[PDB]
Symmetry: C3
Subunit: 158 residues, 3 copies
Amino acid sequence: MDFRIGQGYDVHQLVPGRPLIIGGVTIPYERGLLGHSDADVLLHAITDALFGAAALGDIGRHFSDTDPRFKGADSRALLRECASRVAQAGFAIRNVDSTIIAQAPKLAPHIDAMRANIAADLDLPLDRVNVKAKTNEKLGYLGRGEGIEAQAAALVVR
Amino acid sequence: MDFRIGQGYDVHQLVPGRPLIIGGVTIPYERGLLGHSDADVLLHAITDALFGAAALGDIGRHFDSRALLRECASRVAQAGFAIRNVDSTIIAQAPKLAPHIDAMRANIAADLDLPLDRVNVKAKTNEKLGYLGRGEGIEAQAAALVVR
Amino acid sequence: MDFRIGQGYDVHQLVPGRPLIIGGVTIPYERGLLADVLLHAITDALFGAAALGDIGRHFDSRALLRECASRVAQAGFAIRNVDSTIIAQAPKLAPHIDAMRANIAADLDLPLDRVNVKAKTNEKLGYLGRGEGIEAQAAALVVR
Ligand SMILES: N[C@@H](Cc1c[nH]c2ccccc12)C(=O)NO
Ligand SMILES: [Zn+2]
Ligand SMILES: [Zn+2]
Ligand SMILES: [Zn+2]
C-alpha cells in the first residue's frame, strides 16, 4: 500500500529535417522534433513521471543529453531503462496517463500504436496505459505549430 | 487496492458573444469560451482526467458539458472503477473566480455522485504572462484518482 | 486506504533586480522572480489533495508550506509523496535540487525519498523559453 505519484512535462521544437517520433511511432510529416535524442516528447514526459514517482530525480540526471552515445537515441530504450531503474528501486508501475498537445499532424490515428508501445516497454497490459491527444485551441506557440508538448502522470507502488 | 491516476488539460479562447461557463457556473463577463460544446474548460479537463485514469482514451474519442461529465462518470463506472477524488486548477487573468468556486465544486460533486470533500477546484492567474496573461484564453488542469 | 491526489501550478515573471528563490534556495542569477514558484505549486497540490481549497483562500513561502502541512494533518491526512517540475530556461538548476528537496522534506516532515524535484528548460519556446518567467508543477499523494 506504499503508493507514490509522479508527473512529467516535455516540449520540443518542431523543425524541418527531423523524424517525427511520438510514443515510439514514426509519423510521416514534413517536420519532426528537435533534440539530441530522437526527441520523443511523449516518452520523455512519461519517463520523467516515472523517475519522479520513484523519487529518482529526472530524465536529465539519468541520461546525459551531451553524451554521444545518446545522439539519436531510441527513447523507447530509454523508457525501458527508466522502468528497470524504477524496479531496481523497489517500485512496481500501476498505471500511466498522458496528453499530447499538437496543432498538427493529426494524432488520433496513431494513439493506439503509441499506447501499445508504452505498454510493451513498461511490461503493462494495455488497460493500464492511456494516451490522450489535444490541440491547443489555436493559442500560443503550440497553436502556431512551433513545438509539441506532452504531459504525463504515473502511479507506482513500493 | 487497484488504484489508478489520471490527468487532464484543456484550454479555450475567450471571445465576444458567448456566455462564460466554468464548472457549470455562468459567470458575468464580456466574453465567453469558444467551442463546439459550451466550452466548459474545467469540466473538460476533469472529464479527460477521469477517462485517463480509467484508461478509456479521451474526450475527443468519446464525444452541455455537465451532461458529458455525467456520461463520462457512467463510462468510468461501466469499466468497473469508483472515483475517489478530483482536484483541479483554473488559470484565468479575469474575471475573478473565487466567488464561484463553491458552486463549481457543488456542480462537479453532484455530477460525479461524490461528497463535496472529495472534489476540489483551485483558481490562479498567469501573472500577466502569455496568452493566458493577456486574457485570450482560460486553461484548466485536473487530476483524478479512481479504484477498481 | 483513503488515498487522495492533488495537483499544483504556479508561474512568476523573471526580471532583473530581484533575487531568484526556488524551493527555498537563493540561486545566483542576473534576474529573479517578481514568489517561490515551486513551494506554491506544492502547497496548492497539498491543499488540493485534502480538498481544502487553495493557497489564495488560506493565506516566507516555507512558513506557508509548513502551515499548509499542519492544516492537512488536522484535516486527518498524512502526506505520502510529492513530485514536481520546475521549467526555467536559465540558470542551471540541477546543482540545487538536493537543497530544494531537503527544504521541502523538512517543511513537510517527510523522509527525503518521498520528495522529488525535476528541472526542465522550455526549449526556447514561449515566455518561459525567453526567460521571462519560471513555472512550477507539482503532484501530491495523501491518505486519510
Ligand atoms: N527532453 C529532454 C530529456 C532528456 C535529458 N537528457 C536526455 C538524454 C537522452 C534523451 C533524452 C534526454 C531531451 O533532451 N530530449 O531530447
Ligand atoms: Zn524531450
Ligand atoms: Zn474543452
Ligand atoms: Zn506563486
